[PDB]
Every structure is written in C-alpha cells, then in structure tokens.
Design a protein around this ligand. Structure first.
Ligand SMILES: [Cl-]
Length: 167
C-alpha cells in the first residue's frame, strides 16, 4: 500500500520470468529478456519502446506475440519494471557460438559480454530456453536449471525481516 519489499519483488520477478518463458517455450514463441543488474543498460533501454510497466508473466507473454509491434527485439527489465520492449542489443562476434542458434542468442551473448546483465532466450525454432551471463551461454536448460540460475543470480536477500525500507 506504500512501498514494497525487495525480497518479494525479486521472487515475483523470477516467477514471472519462469511462467512466461515456459508458456512461450511450449508454443515455440521466440523471446529475449535481459535483466539489468549493477551495469547501466540505460543506452539500450532508450532504443526500445518505453513501457515502465509492472512486471507480470501476462504482460511478458503479450509482448512477444509474433507479428506484433512489441515483439521485434529485447525486453529490458530494470529495477522492478519492464522498462522497454523491442530494444536493440549488440550482437556478439564470437565464432564459438554455434551456427544452429539464432540472432536472439547472438544478441543475448553480445549484451552478456559488456554488462553484468542476465539474459533469457526462448528459441522460435525449438522452444529451448537459454541464458547468458558474462560472455557465457547456458544452452537448452531445464526448468529446474533455469529456476536455480535465476534464484542464484537475481535474489540478493536471504530470510530477513520484511520491510518497505530495506531496498
Ligand atoms: Cl511488497
């Protein structure tokens, strides 16, 4: 009703990502979701359509429906908001990334090389879910694996007293 609890926000974020990518994976809908961390991704947010929207699995799903305005490019999540959709991300020039993979994977690898962001990709070809962080690709991960990486990398707080002031 006034302020929010950081631990609740971070767990809602992970749940929203899990539910939306699972929905899109079953239907082979391509998706690209980059979560900003310590590194400013403000330049890339400015390349997309600004949303500044509450995070939900439903919005994330509606964003990536093919042949819609918002689906062509990356969603960037920053703070507790979906900041932009249809954003540009730089492509990796790595020759080690397999040629079986698509341009969404190349964009997720590219941003992972120059930011500490965590990027999730759903393949429009296969429905496989992948993640990138720090120039590394985790390819075709299971739901358990996705859950544990997202838990490790996106929740900062352990069990402590909830408070709208902890931030
Ligand atoms: Cl809350």
């Amino acid at each position: 009703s006034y302020g929010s609890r950081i631990e609740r926000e971070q767990h809602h974020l992970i749940e929203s990502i899990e539910k939306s990518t699972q929905y899109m994976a079953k239907r082979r809908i391509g998706a690209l979701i980059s979560v900003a961390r310590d590194t400013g991704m403000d330049d890339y947010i400015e390349t997309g359509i600004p949303l500044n929207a509450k995070i939900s699995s439903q919005l994330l799903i509606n964003i990536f429906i093919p042949n819609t305005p918002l689906h062509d490019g990356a969603v960037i999540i920053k703070g507790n908001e979906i900041a932009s959709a249809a954003s540009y991300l730089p492509l990796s020039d790595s020759p080690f990334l397999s040629k079986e993979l698509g341009t969404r994977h190349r964009a997720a690898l590219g941003i992972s090389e120059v930011t500490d962001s965590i990027t999730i990709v759903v393949s429009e070809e296969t429905g496989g879910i992948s993640l990138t962080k720090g120039g590394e690709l985790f390819r075709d991960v299971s739901e358990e694996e996705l859950h544990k990486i997202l838990l490790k990398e996106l929740v900062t707080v352990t069990a402590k007293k909830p408070s709208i002031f902890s931030k």
